[PDB]
Protein backbone atom coordinates (compact mmCIF):
# COMPACT_ATOMS: atom_id res chain seq x y z
CA UNK A 1 0.00 0.00 0.00
CA UNK A 2 2.74 2.39 1.03
CA UNK A 3 4.82 3.34 -1.88
CA UNK A 4 8.44 3.01 -2.11
CA UNK A 5 10.08 5.83 -3.69
CA UNK A 6 13.46 5.78 -4.33
CA UNK A 7 15.84 8.98 -4.99
CA UNK A 8 19.39 10.07 -3.82
CA UNK A 9 21.13 12.97 -2.32
CA UNK A 10 22.36 16.01 -4.77
CA UNK A 11 21.76 19.47 -3.67
CA UNK A 12 19.34 21.18 -4.07
CA UNK A 13 17.14 18.15 -4.97
CA UNK A 14 17.33 16.25 -2.10
CA UNK A 15 19.31 17.31 1.14
CA UNK A 16 18.96 16.59 4.67
CA UNK A 17 17.56 19.34 6.69
CA UNK A 18 20.02 20.74 9.69
CA UNK A 19 18.23 18.73 12.55
CA UNK A 20 17.15 15.86 10.36
CA UNK A 21 18.65 13.48 13.53
CA UNK A 22 15.47 14.88 15.50
CA UNK A 23 13.05 13.98 12.39
CA UNK A 24 11.90 10.57 11.16
CA UNK A 25 10.19 9.41 7.61
CA UNK A 26 9.76 12.12 5.07
CA UNK A 27 10.39 14.65 7.09
CA UNK A 28 14.35 14.52 7.31
CA UNK A 29 14.72 15.41 3.81
CA UNK A 30 13.62 18.82 1.92
CA UNK A 31 14.74 19.90 -1.74
CA UNK A 32 13.29 20.65 -5.19
CA UNK A 33 12.45 16.74 -5.98
CA UNK A 34 11.32 16.78 -2.12
CA UNK A 35 8.69 19.09 -2.77
CA UNK A 36 7.96 17.29 -6.28
CA UNK A 37 7.33 13.96 -4.76
CA UNK A 38 5.05 15.33 -2.46
CA UNK A 39 3.05 17.18 -5.23
CA UNK A 40 2.85 13.84 -7.14
CA UNK A 41 1.78 11.91 -4.41
CA UNK A 42 -1.27 14.32 -3.59
CA UNK A 43 -2.48 14.39 -7.63
CA UNK A 44 -1.92 10.54 -7.84
CA UNK A 45 -3.43 10.03 -4.42
CA UNK A 46 -1.00 7.74 -2.74
CA UNK A 47 0.90 7.13 0.69
CA UNK A 48 4.65 6.89 0.14
CA UNK A 49 8.17 6.40 1.84
CA UNK A 50 11.14 8.28 0.31
CA UNK A 51 14.12 5.74 0.57
CA UNK A 52 17.78 6.72 -0.09
CA UNK A 53 18.74 4.55 -2.74
CA UNK A 54 21.35 2.01 -0.91
CA UNK A 55 24.74 2.35 -3.60
CA UNK A 56 24.71 5.76 -4.18
CA UNK A 57 24.23 5.57 -8.05
CA UNK A 58 21.77 6.43 -10.32
CA UNK A 59 21.57 3.40 -13.05
CA UNK A 60 23.52 1.73 -15.56
CA UNK A 61 24.33 -2.11 -16.62
CA UNK A 62 27.29 -3.76 -15.74
CA UNK A 63 28.68 -4.97 -19.17
CA UNK A 64 29.58 -8.03 -17.76
CA UNK A 65 26.89 -9.44 -15.12
CA UNK A 66 24.15 -7.99 -16.41
CA UNK A 67 22.93 -6.36 -13.50
CA UNK A 68 21.52 -2.82 -13.73
CA UNK A 69 22.62 -0.77 -10.27
CA UNK A 70 21.46 2.29 -8.74
CA UNK A 71 18.21 3.93 -8.66
CA UNK A 72 16.99 2.27 -11.87
CA UNK A 73 17.97 -1.06 -10.40
CA UNK A 74 15.74 -0.76 -7.93
CA UNK A 75 12.61 -0.11 -10.07
CA UNK A 76 14.13 -3.06 -12.27
CA UNK A 77 14.35 -5.81 -9.55
CA UNK A 78 11.01 -4.83 -7.78
CA UNK A 79 12.57 -3.14 -5.27
CA UNK A 80 11.06 0.88 -5.39
CA UNK A 81 7.84 2.14 -6.94
CA UNK A 82 8.77 5.17 -8.49
CA UNK A 83 12.25 7.09 -8.89
CA UNK A 84 12.38 10.87 -8.22
CA UNK A 85 15.84 12.38 -8.60
CA UNK A 86 17.82 14.30 -11.66
CA UNK A 87 17.74 11.20 -13.32
CA UNK A 88 18.46 11.85 -16.53
CA UNK A 89 16.35 10.45 -19.78
CA UNK A 90 18.43 8.38 -21.43
CA UNK A 91 17.57 5.76 -24.66
CA UNK A 92 19.20 2.67 -22.45
CA UNK A 93 17.55 3.56 -19.41
CA UNK A 94 13.77 3.99 -21.17
CA UNK A 95 14.66 0.77 -22.65
CA UNK A 96 14.18 -1.10 -19.40
CA UNK A 97 11.61 1.65 -17.52
CA UNK A 98 9.39 4.00 -18.19
CA UNK A 99 9.74 7.80 -18.10
CA UNK A 100 7.57 10.40 -17.40
CA UNK A 101 7.23 13.63 -19.54
CA UNK A 102 10.18 15.82 -18.61
CA UNK A 103 10.07 17.57 -15.04
CA UNK A 104 13.46 19.85 -15.99
CA UNK A 105 15.15 20.57 -18.75
CA UNK A 106 19.14 20.27 -19.23
CA UNK A 107 21.97 20.12 -21.32
CA UNK A 108 25.76 19.15 -20.78
CA UNK A 109 27.80 22.42 -19.85
CA UNK A 110 31.05 23.86 -19.36
CA UNK A 111 31.93 25.56 -15.52
CA UNK A 112 34.84 27.67 -15.28
CA UNK A 113 36.43 29.24 -12.56
CA UNK A 114 35.92 33.18 -13.18
CA UNK A 115 38.77 34.55 -15.27
CA UNK A 116 39.03 31.13 -17.49
CA UNK A 117 39.74 31.62 -21.04
CA UNK A 118 37.57 28.97 -22.35
CA UNK A 119 34.02 30.29 -24.06
CA UNK A 120 33.28 27.01 -25.81
CA UNK A 121 33.40 23.55 -25.93
CA UNK A 122 35.41 23.54 -29.20
CA UNK A 123 37.94 26.00 -27.12
CA UNK A 124 38.46 23.38 -24.46
CA UNK A 125 39.21 20.76 -27.11
CA UNK A 126 42.25 22.88 -29.00
CA UNK A 127 44.15 22.97 -26.41
CA UNK A 128 45.54 21.35 -23.46
CA UNK A 129 46.91 23.91 -20.66
CA UNK A 130 43.64 24.34 -19.05
CA UNK A 131 42.81 20.50 -17.98
CA UNK A 132 39.25 19.37 -18.25
CA UNK A 133 37.01 16.59 -17.30
CA UNK A 134 33.68 15.19 -16.37
CA UNK A 135 32.06 12.83 -13.35
CA UNK A 136 33.67 9.01 -13.56
CA UNK A 137 30.25 7.58 -14.08
CA UNK A 138 26.61 8.95 -15.36
CA UNK A 139 25.11 10.05 -18.38
CA UNK A 140 27.66 13.19 -19.28
CA UNK A 141 30.54 10.60 -19.40
CA UNK A 142 28.61 8.13 -21.38
CA UNK A 143 27.85 11.36 -23.93
CA UNK A 144 31.72 11.84 -24.52
CA UNK A 145 32.14 7.66 -24.45
CA UNK A 146 29.76 7.30 -27.36
CA UNK A 147 29.18 10.55 -29.31
CA UNK A 148 30.71 10.26 -33.11
CA UNK A 149 31.23 14.25 -33.55
CA UNK A 150 34.01 15.67 -34.22
CA UNK A 151 35.15 18.08 -31.30
CA UNK A 152 33.69 15.53 -28.93
CA UNK A 153 35.41 12.74 -29.95
CA UNK A 154 39.05 14.72 -29.86
CA UNK A 155 37.93 16.11 -26.39
CA UNK A 156 37.02 12.49 -24.83
CA UNK A 157 40.55 11.06 -26.62
CA UNK A 158 41.93 13.59 -24.34
CA UNK A 159 40.06 12.85 -21.28
CA UNK A 160 39.98 8.88 -21.32
CA UNK A 161 44.56 9.47 -21.17
CA UNK A 162 44.52 12.83 -19.28
CA UNK A 163 47.51 12.44 -16.21
CA UNK A 164 46.56 12.80 -13.17
CA UNK A 165 42.71 11.54 -14.18
CA UNK A 166 40.23 14.52 -14.69
CA UNK A 167 37.35 12.21 -13.78
CA UNK A 168 35.71 13.31 -10.56
CA UNK A 169 33.33 11.11 -8.00
CA UNK A 170 30.91 13.30 -6.88
CA UNK A 171 29.58 16.74 -7.75
CA UNK A 172 31.13 18.91 -4.85
CA UNK A 173 34.11 17.57 -5.73
CA UNK A 174 34.50 18.30 -9.38
CA UNK A 175 33.84 21.71 -8.34
CA UNK A 176 35.84 21.97 -5.61
CA UNK A 177 38.88 20.67 -8.22
CA UNK A 178 37.55 24.17 -10.44
CA UNK A 179 37.59 26.30 -7.80
CA UNK A 180 41.05 25.39 -5.91
CA UNK A 181 42.47 25.30 -9.88
CA UNK A 182 44.09 28.60 -10.29
CA UNK A 183 41.80 28.70 -14.05
CA UNK A 184 43.60 25.35 -14.95
CA UNK A 185 40.72 22.97 -14.51
CA UNK A 186 36.91 23.35 -16.22
CA UNK A 187 33.99 21.07 -14.71
CA UNK A 188 31.80 19.31 -17.48
CA UNK A 189 28.78 18.44 -15.97
CA UNK A 190 24.33 19.17 -15.94
CA UNK A 191 23.60 22.68 -16.55
CA UNK A 192 20.58 22.63 -13.77
CA UNK A 193 24.23 21.59 -11.26
CA UNK A 194 25.94 24.03 -13.08
CA UNK A 195 23.28 27.09 -12.79
CA UNK A 196 23.05 26.10 -9.09
CA UNK A 197 26.59 26.12 -8.01
CA UNK A 198 27.01 29.58 -9.80
CA UNK A 199 24.12 31.79 -7.08
CA UNK A 200 26.14 29.74 -4.37
CA UNK A 201 29.21 31.89 -2.30
CA UNK A 202 31.87 32.12 -2.63
CA UNK A 203 30.59 33.45 -6.36
CA UNK A 204 33.67 32.17 -8.40
CA UNK A 205 32.26 29.86 -10.54
CA UNK A 206 30.12 30.79 -13.71
CA UNK A 207 28.41 28.76 -16.50
CA UNK A 208 30.11 29.19 -19.82
CA UNK A 209 28.70 28.61 -23.51
CA UNK A 210 25.47 27.14 -24.97
CA UNK A 211 24.82 23.49 -23.80
CA UNK A 212 26.42 20.92 -25.91
CA UNK A 213 22.64 18.96 -25.87
CA UNK A 214 19.46 19.05 -24.63
CA UNK A 215 17.42 16.40 -22.98
CA UNK A 216 15.13 16.43 -20.03
CA UNK A 217 15.01 14.80 -16.02
CA UNK A 218 12.05 12.06 -15.80
CA UNK A 219 10.18 10.37 -12.98
CA UNK A 220 10.82 6.80 -13.22
CA UNK A 221 8.53 3.73 -12.84
CA UNK A 222 9.23 -0.04 -13.27
CA UNK A 223 7.58 -1.07 -16.95
CA UNK A 224 3.83 -2.14 -16.91
CA UNK A 225 3.10 -0.34 -13.65
CA UNK A 226 0.10 0.92 -12.88
CA UNK A 227 1.24 3.89 -11.56
CA UNK A 228 3.13 5.09 -14.67
CA UNK A 229 0.02 6.55 -16.96
CA UNK A 230 -1.18 8.61 -13.06
CA UNK A 231 2.67 10.08 -12.75
CA UNK A 232 3.06 10.69 -16.47
CA UNK A 233 0.05 12.96 -16.34
CA UNK A 234 1.06 14.34 -12.62
CA UNK A 235 3.92 15.86 -14.10
CA UNK A 236 1.86 17.38 -17.04
CA UNK A 237 -0.69 19.45 -14.90
CA UNK A 238 2.21 20.58 -12.52
CA UNK A 239 3.70 21.83 -15.40
CA UNK A 240 0.87 23.85 -16.75
CA UNK A 241 0.36 24.70 -13.30
CA UNK A 242 3.60 26.70 -13.36
CA UNK A 243 4.67 24.49 -10.15
CA UNK A 244 7.45 23.20 -11.46
CA UNK A 245 8.66 26.66 -12.56
CA UNK A 246 7.43 27.92 -8.80
CA UNK A 247 10.05 24.75 -7.41
CA UNK A 248 13.02 25.64 -9.78
CA UNK A 249 12.85 29.20 -8.99
CA UNK A 250 12.15 28.48 -5.06
CA UNK A 251 15.49 25.89 -4.89
CA UNK A 252 17.74 27.49 -7.56
CA UNK A 253 17.31 31.33 -7.81
CA UNK A 254 14.90 33.07 -4.74
CA UNK A 255 17.21 32.92 -2.32
CA UNK A 256 20.42 32.85 -4.52
CA UNK A 257 23.82 33.90 -2.72
CA UNK A 258 25.21 35.91 -5.44
CA UNK B 1 0.94 -2.37 -44.33
CA UNK B 2 1.78 1.14 -45.37
CA UNK B 3 1.70 3.56 -42.61
CA UNK B 4 -0.58 6.57 -42.79
CA UNK B 5 1.65 9.36 -41.08
CA UNK B 6 -0.71 12.60 -40.79
CA UNK B 7 0.84 16.17 -40.77
CA UNK B 8 0.05 19.81 -41.09
CA UNK B 9 1.59 23.15 -43.43
CA UNK B 10 3.19 25.06 -41.43
CA UNK B 11 6.98 26.73 -42.06
CA UNK B 12 9.70 24.99 -42.00
CA UNK B 13 8.08 22.01 -40.51
CA UNK B 14 6.37 20.92 -43.35
CA UNK B 15 5.86 22.82 -46.86
CA UNK B 16 4.95 21.97 -50.69
CA UNK B 17 8.42 22.30 -52.58
CA UNK B 18 8.49 24.66 -55.01
CA UNK B 19 7.70 22.12 -58.39
CA UNK B 20 6.03 19.84 -56.28
CA UNK B 21 3.24 19.74 -58.89
CA UNK B 22 5.48 17.98 -61.01
CA UNK B 23 6.32 15.15 -58.26
CA UNK B 24 4.10 12.77 -56.38
CA UNK B 25 3.06 11.03 -53.46
CA UNK B 26 6.38 11.76 -50.57
CA UNK B 27 8.42 13.64 -52.36
CA UNK B 28 6.17 16.88 -53.05
CA UNK B 29 6.65 18.19 -49.47
CA UNK B 30 9.81 18.60 -47.37
CA UNK B 31 10.76 20.57 -44.31
CA UNK B 32 11.39 19.35 -40.33
CA UNK B 33 8.96 17.21 -40.10
CA UNK B 34 9.44 15.58 -43.23
CA UNK B 35 13.16 14.88 -42.62
CA UNK B 36 12.36 14.02 -39.04
CA UNK B 37 9.39 11.32 -40.29
CA UNK B 38 12.08 9.54 -42.91
CA UNK B 39 14.23 9.42 -39.82
CA UNK B 40 12.17 7.65 -37.56
CA UNK B 41 10.68 5.66 -40.51
CA UNK B 42 14.48 4.24 -41.17
CA UNK B 43 14.76 3.51 -37.38
CA UNK B 44 11.42 2.00 -36.71
CA UNK B 45 11.62 -0.23 -40.02
CA UNK B 46 7.93 1.02 -41.73
CA UNK B 47 6.82 2.06 -44.87
CA UNK B 48 4.72 5.58 -44.67
CA UNK B 49 2.42 7.73 -46.53
CA UNK B 50 2.45 11.66 -45.54
CA UNK B 51 -1.35 12.70 -45.63
CA UNK B 52 -2.11 16.45 -44.52
CA UNK B 53 -5.01 16.73 -41.80
CA UNK B 54 -8.31 17.64 -43.81
CA UNK B 55 -9.43 19.99 -41.19
CA UNK B 56 -6.52 21.71 -41.19
CA UNK B 57 -6.02 21.85 -37.03
CA UNK B 58 -3.92 20.19 -34.56
CA UNK B 59 -6.39 18.66 -32.14
CA UNK B 60 -9.03 19.82 -29.24
CA UNK B 61 -12.09 18.61 -28.08
CA UNK B 62 -15.36 20.35 -29.03
CA UNK B 63 -17.17 21.07 -25.92
CA UNK B 64 -20.95 19.71 -27.45
CA UNK B 65 -20.09 17.25 -29.44
CA UNK B 66 -17.20 15.68 -27.65
CA UNK B 67 -15.53 14.84 -31.29
CA UNK B 68 -11.87 15.39 -31.14
CA UNK B 69 -10.43 17.35 -34.61
CA UNK B 70 -7.42 17.66 -36.61
CA UNK B 71 -4.46 15.15 -36.10
CA UNK B 72 -5.53 14.44 -32.14
CA UNK B 73 -8.66 13.44 -33.94
CA UNK B 74 -7.60 11.10 -36.44
CA UNK B 75 -5.03 8.92 -34.60
CA UNK B 76 -8.62 8.78 -31.62
CA UNK B 77 -10.38 7.75 -34.39
CA UNK B 78 -8.09 5.24 -36.17
CA UNK B 79 -7.72 7.21 -40.04
CA UNK B 80 -3.90 8.05 -39.14
CA UNK B 81 -1.37 5.98 -37.49
CA UNK B 82 0.90 8.02 -36.19
CA UNK B 83 1.26 12.46 -36.39
CA UNK B 84 4.32 13.64 -37.01
CA UNK B 85 3.83 17.62 -36.67
CA UNK B 86 4.66 20.71 -33.95
CA UNK B 87 2.33 18.97 -31.81
CA UNK B 88 2.62 20.71 -28.22
CA UNK B 89 2.11 18.60 -25.79
CA UNK B 90 -0.54 18.88 -23.40
CA UNK B 91 -2.46 17.25 -20.83
CA UNK B 92 -5.58 16.90 -22.60
CA UNK B 93 -4.33 15.73 -25.51
CA UNK B 94 -1.96 12.93 -23.42
CA UNK B 95 -4.91 12.04 -22.01
CA UNK B 96 -6.05 10.86 -25.20
CA UNK B 97 -3.04 9.84 -27.45
CA UNK B 98 0.40 8.67 -26.47
CA UNK B 99 3.12 11.03 -27.05
CA UNK B 100 7.13 10.62 -27.80
CA UNK B 101 9.48 12.32 -25.47
CA UNK B 102 9.65 15.73 -27.02
CA UNK B 103 11.69 16.10 -30.50
CA UNK B 104 11.83 20.25 -29.97
CA UNK B 105 11.76 22.31 -26.96
CA UNK B 106 9.67 25.42 -26.94
CA UNK B 107 7.92 28.20 -24.82
CA UNK B 108 5.09 30.86 -25.66
CA UNK B 109 7.01 33.93 -26.52
CA UNK B 110 6.67 37.65 -27.56
CA UNK B 111 7.45 38.93 -31.33
CA UNK B 112 7.71 43.03 -31.95
CA UNK B 113 8.44 45.08 -34.58
CA UNK B 114 12.25 45.64 -33.94
CA UNK B 115 11.55 49.21 -31.85
CA UNK B 116 8.93 48.16 -30.18
CA UNK B 117 8.94 49.75 -26.52
CA UNK B 118 8.41 45.85 -24.70
CA UNK B 119 10.64 43.63 -23.07
CA UNK B 120 8.18 41.32 -21.24
CA UNK B 121 4.90 39.68 -20.62
CA UNK B 122 4.64 42.35 -17.62
CA UNK B 123 5.25 45.44 -20.06
CA UNK B 124 2.04 44.04 -22.26
CA UNK B 125 -0.16 43.24 -19.24
CA UNK B 126 0.40 47.41 -18.06
CA UNK B 127 -0.56 49.37 -21.07
CA UNK B 128 -3.18 49.15 -24.02
CA UNK B 129 -1.36 51.09 -26.41
CA UNK B 130 0.54 48.37 -28.12
CA UNK B 131 -2.21 45.80 -28.91
CA UNK B 132 -1.37 42.02 -28.15
CA UNK B 133 -2.67 38.84 -29.01
CA UNK B 134 -2.13 34.55 -29.84
CA UNK B 135 -3.84 32.39 -33.06
CA UNK B 136 -7.54 32.28 -32.55
CA UNK B 137 -7.44 28.45 -31.51
CA UNK B 138 -3.78 26.06 -30.27
CA UNK B 139 -2.07 25.76 -26.99
CA UNK B 140 -1.44 29.13 -26.74
CA UNK B 141 -4.72 30.66 -26.14
CA UNK B 142 -5.26 27.75 -23.90
CA UNK B 143 -2.50 28.76 -21.75
CA UNK B 144 -4.19 32.11 -21.34
CA UNK B 145 -7.53 30.84 -20.79
CA UNK B 146 -6.67 28.81 -18.37
CA UNK B 147 -4.38 30.77 -16.38
CA UNK B 148 -4.37 31.63 -12.30
CA UNK B 149 -1.06 33.50 -12.69
CA UNK B 150 -1.90 36.90 -11.95
CA UNK B 151 0.06 38.84 -15.34
CA UNK B 152 -1.61 35.97 -17.39
CA UNK B 153 -4.61 36.33 -15.96
CA UNK B 154 -4.63 39.93 -16.30
CA UNK B 155 -3.83 39.48 -20.18
CA UNK B 156 -6.58 37.22 -20.85
CA UNK B 157 -9.09 39.58 -19.57
CA UNK B 158 -7.95 42.05 -22.10
CA UNK B 159 -7.60 39.64 -25.12
CA UNK B 160 -11.23 38.32 -24.81
CA UNK B 161 -12.64 41.77 -24.59
CA UNK B 162 -10.49 43.50 -27.22
CA UNK B 163 -11.73 45.37 -30.16
CA UNK B 164 -10.87 44.87 -33.20
CA UNK B 165 -10.27 41.06 -32.16
CA UNK B 166 -6.68 40.48 -31.18
CA UNK B 167 -6.59 37.17 -32.69
CA UNK B 168 -5.49 35.70 -35.69
CA UNK B 169 -6.16 32.70 -37.74
CA UNK B 170 -2.47 31.53 -39.08
CA UNK B 171 1.09 32.02 -38.04
CA UNK B 172 1.49 34.55 -41.16
CA UNK B 173 -1.33 37.11 -40.31
CA UNK B 174 0.25 37.42 -37.08
CA UNK B 175 3.24 37.90 -38.62
CA UNK B 176 2.23 39.96 -41.05
CA UNK B 177 -0.02 42.27 -38.43
CA UNK B 178 2.98 42.58 -36.55
CA UNK B 179 4.86 44.13 -39.13
CA UNK B 180 2.06 46.19 -40.74
CA UNK B 181 1.18 47.91 -37.05
CA UNK B 182 3.89 50.57 -37.33
CA UNK B 183 5.28 48.97 -33.62
CA UNK B 184 1.35 48.48 -31.72
CA UNK B 185 0.91 45.35 -31.98
CA UNK B 186 2.43 42.26 -30.67
CA UNK B 187 1.75 38.52 -31.07
CA UNK B 188 2.60 35.98 -28.16
CA UNK B 189 3.13 32.57 -30.30
CA UNK B 190 5.90 29.49 -29.92
CA UNK B 191 9.72 30.27 -29.47
CA UNK B 192 10.46 28.10 -32.74
CA UNK B 193 8.45 29.79 -35.09
CA UNK B 194 9.57 33.11 -33.39
CA UNK B 195 13.26 31.84 -33.92
CA UNK B 196 12.08 30.70 -37.43
CA UNK B 197 10.50 34.45 -38.33
CA UNK B 198 13.35 36.19 -36.75
CA UNK B 199 15.69 34.92 -39.49
CA UNK B 200 13.53 35.71 -42.82
CA UNK B 201 13.88 38.64 -44.45
CA UNK B 202 12.62 42.07 -44.14
CA UNK B 203 14.45 40.98 -40.66
CA UNK B 204 11.85 43.21 -38.94
CA UNK B 205 10.85 41.24 -35.89
CA UNK B 206 12.26 40.06 -32.71
CA UNK B 207 11.82 37.54 -29.96
CA UNK B 208 12.03 39.66 -26.77
CA UNK B 209 12.30 38.40 -23.22
CA UNK B 210 12.22 34.89 -22.02
CA UNK B 211 9.22 32.40 -22.51
CA UNK B 212 6.20 32.32 -21.02
CA UNK B 213 6.30 28.60 -20.04
CA UNK B 214 8.46 25.40 -20.94
CA UNK B 215 6.85 22.49 -22.90
CA UNK B 216 7.83 20.20 -26.16
CA UNK B 217 6.51 19.12 -29.34
CA UNK B 218 5.97 15.22 -29.29
CA UNK B 219 5.48 12.64 -32.32
CA UNK B 220 1.89 11.50 -31.48
CA UNK B 221 0.10 7.96 -31.61
CA UNK B 222 -2.97 6.08 -30.79
CA UNK B 223 -3.53 4.56 -27.54
CA UNK B 224 -2.15 0.64 -27.49
CA UNK B 225 -0.79 1.26 -31.17
CA UNK B 226 1.99 -1.25 -31.61
CA UNK B 227 4.37 1.62 -33.24
CA UNK B 228 4.18 3.39 -30.05
CA UNK B 229 7.58 2.02 -28.09
CA UNK B 230 9.74 1.67 -31.31
CA UNK B 231 8.70 5.67 -31.93
CA UNK B 232 9.28 6.52 -28.67
CA UNK B 233 12.62 5.04 -28.80
CA UNK B 234 13.52 6.20 -32.44
CA UNK B 235 13.40 10.04 -31.46
CA UNK B 236 15.47 9.36 -28.06
CA UNK B 237 18.34 7.56 -30.54
CA UNK B 238 17.81 10.50 -32.93
CA UNK B 239 18.39 13.11 -29.93
CA UNK B 240 21.47 11.03 -28.62
CA UNK B 241 22.60 11.59 -32.00
CA UNK B 242 22.88 14.66 -32.98
CA UNK B 243 20.62 14.63 -35.27
CA UNK B 244 17.31 16.38 -33.80
CA UNK B 245 20.13 19.63 -33.50
CA UNK B 246 21.43 18.70 -37.04
CA UNK B 247 17.79 19.49 -38.39
CA UNK B 248 16.80 22.60 -36.35
CA UNK B 249 20.36 24.41 -37.47
CA UNK B 250 19.57 23.18 -40.82
CA UNK B 251 15.88 24.29 -41.19
CA UNK B 252 16.28 27.68 -38.83
CA UNK B 253 19.57 28.42 -39.01
CA UNK B 254 21.80 27.46 -41.53
CA UNK B 255 20.22 29.40 -44.34
CA UNK B 256 19.05 32.17 -42.51
CA UNK B 257 18.57 35.30 -44.48
CA UNK B 258 19.44 37.68 -41.54
C1 LIG C 1 24.60 13.50 -10.36
C2 LIG C 1 24.73 12.48 -11.25
C3 LIG C 1 25.89 11.57 -11.09
C4 LIG C 1 23.68 12.24 -12.27
C5 LIG C 1 22.54 13.22 -12.42
N1 LIG C 1 22.13 13.23 -13.85
C6 LIG C 1 23.05 12.26 -14.56
C7 LIG C 1 22.44 10.86 -14.70
O1 LIG C 1 21.25 10.69 -14.60
O2 LIG C 1 23.28 9.91 -15.24
C8 LIG C 1 24.32 12.34 -13.65
C9 LIG C 1 25.27 13.55 -13.83
C10 LIG C 1 26.14 13.66 -15.08
O3 LIG C 1 26.40 12.44 -15.66
O4 LIG C 1 26.83 14.66 -15.33
C1 LIG D 1 0.56 26.34 -35.41
C2 LIG D 1 -0.36 25.99 -34.46
C3 LIG D 1 -1.73 26.52 -34.60
C4 LIG D 1 0.00 25.02 -33.39
C5 LIG D 1 1.42 24.54 -33.27
N1 LIG D 1 1.69 24.27 -31.82
C6 LIG D 1 0.41 24.62 -31.09
C7 LIG D 1 -0.48 23.39 -30.85
O1 LIG D 1 -0.03 22.28 -30.89
O2 LIG D 1 -1.70 23.68 -30.28
C8 LIG D 1 -0.19 25.71 -32.05
C9 LIG D 1 0.38 27.14 -31.97
C10 LIG D 1 0.08 28.02 -30.75
O3 LIG D 1 -1.08 27.66 -30.11
O4 LIG D 1 0.60 29.13 -30.58
ZN1 LIG E 1 21.93 11.36 10.30
ZN1 LIG F 1 -0.63 21.75 -55.80
Same mark, same amino acid.
Given at each position: ?6 ? $? ?100 ? $? ?148
Amino acid at each position: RTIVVTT $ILESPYVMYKKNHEQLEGNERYEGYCVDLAYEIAKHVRIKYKLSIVGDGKYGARDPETKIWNGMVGELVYGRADIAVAPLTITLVREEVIDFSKPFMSLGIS $IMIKKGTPIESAEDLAKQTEIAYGTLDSGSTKEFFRRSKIAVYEKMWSYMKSAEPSVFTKTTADGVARVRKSKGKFAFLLESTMNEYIEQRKPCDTMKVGGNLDSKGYGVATPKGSALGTPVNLAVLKLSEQGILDKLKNKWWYDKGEC
